[PDB]
Design a protein around this ligand. Structure first.
Ligand SMILES: [Mg+2]
Ligand SMILES: [Mg+2]
Lengths: 421, 169, 48, 50, 169
């Protein structure tokens, strides 16, 4: 009964805590026996740069030491692997009554590089970065007590620091990055170059005016994913242009990994931030373009989510759509048309629910006006998990269901649209 | 930030001391002490750890930033050859474990371009001043807040400054 | 190259190129008697 | 080797010495041996007895 | 005795920390403090004072002991190249004289050959770890016990350990 990890397909770096030490006193600096009333200090004067990191991997060819170090440098911007100048010193003063023993251990910080692909880890590497020690004080043992003979323990690690799990996505270094050298004001068409040649890649860009934006490839094909460069726009900034910070640390906002997806992104973009757009391997030579449009009307009601375009809803019966489930308090949208001819009068009884993940849904009636789309909120507080309630909808009309995930029980969400009449 | 009350031109700005960078918190390492002991973590600002970090713009390259900042503010090329030490000491309570981690602090300098009282270009220099540590007492298996470990954007642990001087042609 | 091709300097006075000797400085007054709470610096730091 | 093993991993040295040693050992001995006046005669376009 | 509850074969053993050697008690000197003064003594374990001491046997020569011990336990050849410092601090009572002397402590490793639940051969390695001081209050001319100054046989100031692993052919 493991927990579900709602990460998009990509490379992630996980800080799993500090204070790790090897077993069988492999990292033992030493022990000081401090007499009553005395003091004892163990010092790392850092007179030598040399620190020794540890590394194990499941796949050497792709997740090598150089690759893992570069990914660590990408995520947390670490750059001292084999050296360190940081001083630490452990001082303990025994009480006036009895003596004291202090043991000093060299510690490590545990980083885990993972290749997460569709709900499971396909490649995992552990990098232990030399930390700043661990000091434990004990009562001076009675000199005999009993010398008990014990077998050694297995090679491993013991964490004496606090619990920690910090996840940061990293740009895949094998995929190209194109640059939109100019900020996007209200509308922009980015022609996908023939240089990349239908290979998955990233598009780095910035926005002129903070606001909501609709992003889509042509015919909403293929599906895109949008990332925010973590910590971007803090330092250097040119108004109306792009300041490439070379930040490889990315935060997944939204997007589907399946490239055969009809979907378009509605996302809040800040003028003072850099954003990446990962578009996957397209199977066609046909020309494709990326469309940015600053949404002023009711598409703003869809932030931030990838809206699914539904086309196979042409018959009456049971229809279910399986997509990668967003995290809790995140959104996923479905745009769907009720089958049948639209004459304002014909109605069909619709039942909307999900299989395993509970969420709150909101229905919008979509009327394409002359100023874009218009969304009329007609249904709120929709508990979709095994929902048995039904609502009658006009035949031939367009609707958009926005689902906010509240309980995360499965890597995928299956939206069932059952239609009667 | 936008539309300052400054005349058009270029400016050198000091933003103050005590700037910590994003995602760089625990890259220096941490110490775990316990049961009445005292842990002292410190560093010596010399040579490579004293090298400043530059973030230039098309109008403000590395040399422009360095020369203007050093003309107005503290000359960090001369001053970073002289070693300067710092340390932090914390004592663990009895029968409990304490964690402490160290991260450098930086002096944040800016080169800004004002056109019609609105900042259109900003380049940033971080000069390694000193350090700053954070500590917490923890129980086995206790959850720790994500703010203690990780930092999303560059921030100043002290009150920010804004000391501007117009760069003369 | 001439400017950077300094002749190799001789090591520490006692003979060696490896490491300094370190030394302790400072104290916090007191309850606690913070006598070993102090700073540690390499002693020569330039012995070459 | 004295630099690479001892002087490098010794942060009780100013950069003014070890960085200069680093740049000094970027050169090979054969580079010094192959260096002569003909190279500068070509580079500067300076005539000299041959 | 020399009888142990182990199967026949060769074993690597860690005996623990805090081993001081015979006749090597005052090899480093001592301090004489008095009347409320606080005496502090420190040392730095680097290379020539971090020399490990081998006591091999015909079956277990130096290479065997070193390789086995470093494979199973702490890797001392690279660890002793990193300078580690340590200090002790005593405070003499008023109007009294106190003498404190400092000596090196060591890690004891053993390579043992076991046959018929009895050790028939044992080789011993000492790896420098840290130091340890002994202090006494004294008056001018007072006779001091011979045990305080002189150690006849190698002993462990701490709890002796026995951490064993069978050596593979
Ligand atoms: Mg599909
Ligand atoms: Mg000055």
């Amino acid at each position: 009964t493991q927990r579900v990890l709602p990460y998009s397909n990509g490379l992630y770096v996980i800080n799993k805590g500090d204070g790790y030490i090897r077993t069988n006193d492999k990292d033992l600096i030493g022990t000081l026996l401090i007499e009553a009333g005395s003091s004892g200090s163990i010092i790392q004067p850092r007179l030598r740069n040399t620190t020794r990191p540890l590394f194990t991997t499941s796949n050497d060819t792709k997740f090598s030491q150089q690759y893992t170090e570069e990914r660590l440098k990408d995520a947390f911007n670490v750059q001292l692997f084999n050296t360190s100048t940081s001083l630490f010193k452990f001082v303990e003063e025994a009480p006036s009554d009895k003596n004291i023993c202090i043991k000093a251990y060299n510690t490590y910080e545990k980083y885990e590089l993972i290749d997460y692909q569709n709900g499971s880890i396909v490649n995992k590497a552990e990098y232990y970065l030399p930390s700043l020690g661990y000091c434990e004080v004990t009562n001076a043992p009675s000199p005999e007590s009993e010398v008990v003979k014990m077998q050694v323990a297995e090679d491993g690690f013991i964490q004496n620091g606090p619990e920690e799990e910090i996840v940061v996505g990293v740009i895949d270094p094998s995929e190209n990055i194109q640059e939109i050298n100019t900020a996007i004001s209200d509308n922009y068409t980015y022609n996908i170059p023939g240089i990349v040649n239908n290979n998955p890649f990233y598009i780095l860009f910035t926005v002129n005016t903070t606001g909501i934006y609709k992003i889509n490839a042509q015919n909403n094909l293929p599906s895109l994913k949008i990332y925010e460069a973590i910590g971007s726009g803090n330092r250097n900034f040119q108004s109306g242009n792009l300041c490439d910070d070379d930040i490889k640390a990315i935060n997944y906002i939204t997007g589907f990994d399946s490239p055969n997806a009809k979907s378009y992104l509605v996302v809040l973009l800040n003028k003072d931030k850099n954003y990446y757009i990962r578009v996957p391997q397209t199977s066609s030579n046909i020309e494709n373009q990326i469309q940015f449009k600053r949404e002023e009307g009711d598409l703003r009601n869809l932030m931030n989510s990838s809206v699914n375009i539904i086309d196979n809803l042409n018959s009456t019966g049971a229809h279910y759509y399986t997509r990668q489930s967003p995290d809790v308090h995140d959104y996923i949208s479905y745009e769907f048309t009720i089958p049948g001819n639209f004459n304002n009068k014909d109605t069909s009884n619709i039942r909307l629910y999900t299989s395993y993940n509970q969420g709150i849904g909101t229905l919008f009636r979509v009327t394409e006006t002359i100023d874009g789309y218009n969304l009329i909120n007609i249904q709120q507080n929709l508990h979709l998990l095994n929902n048995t309630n039904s609502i009658r909808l006009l035949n031939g009309a367009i609707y958009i269901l926005k689902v906010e995930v509240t309980e995360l029980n499965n890597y995928n969400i299956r939206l069932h649209i059952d239609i009667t009449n | 930030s936008d539309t300052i009350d400054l005349a058009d031109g270029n400016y050198v700005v000091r933003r103050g001391d005590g700037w910590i960078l994003s995602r760089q918190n625990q890259i220096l390492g941490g110490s775990v002490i316990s049961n009445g002991s005292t842990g002292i973590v410190g560093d010596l600002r010399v040579n490579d750890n004293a090298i400043p970090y530059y973030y230039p713009t098309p109008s403000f390259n590395e040399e422009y930033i360095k020369n203007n900042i050093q003309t107005v503010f503290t000359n960090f090329t001369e001053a970073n050859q002289i070693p300067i030490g710092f340390e932090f000491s914390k004592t663990a309570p009895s029968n409990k474990n304490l964690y402490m981690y160290l991260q450098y602090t930086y002096i944040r300098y800016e080169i800004i371009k004002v056109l019609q009282h609105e900042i259109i270009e900003r380049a940033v220099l971080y000069v390694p001043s000193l350090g700053y540590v954070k500590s917490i007492e923890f129980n086995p298996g206790e959850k720790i807040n994500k703010d203690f470990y990780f930092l999303t954007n560059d921030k100043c642990i002290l009150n920010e400054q804004f000391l501007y001087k117009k760069i003369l042609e | 190259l001439i400017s950077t091709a300094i002749p190799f300097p001789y090591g520490y006075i006692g003979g060696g190129y490896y490491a300094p000797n370190m030394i302790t400085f400072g104290s916090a007054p007191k309850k606690k008697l913070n006598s070993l709470i102090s700073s540690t610096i390499p002693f020569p730091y330039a012995g070459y | 080797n004295i630099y690479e093993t001892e002087i490098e991993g010794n942060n009780a040295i100013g950069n003014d010495i070890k960085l200069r040693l680093k740049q000094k050992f970027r050169i090979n001995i054969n580079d010094i041996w192959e260096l002569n006046l003909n190279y500068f005669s070509k580079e500067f376009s300076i005539m000299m007895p041959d």
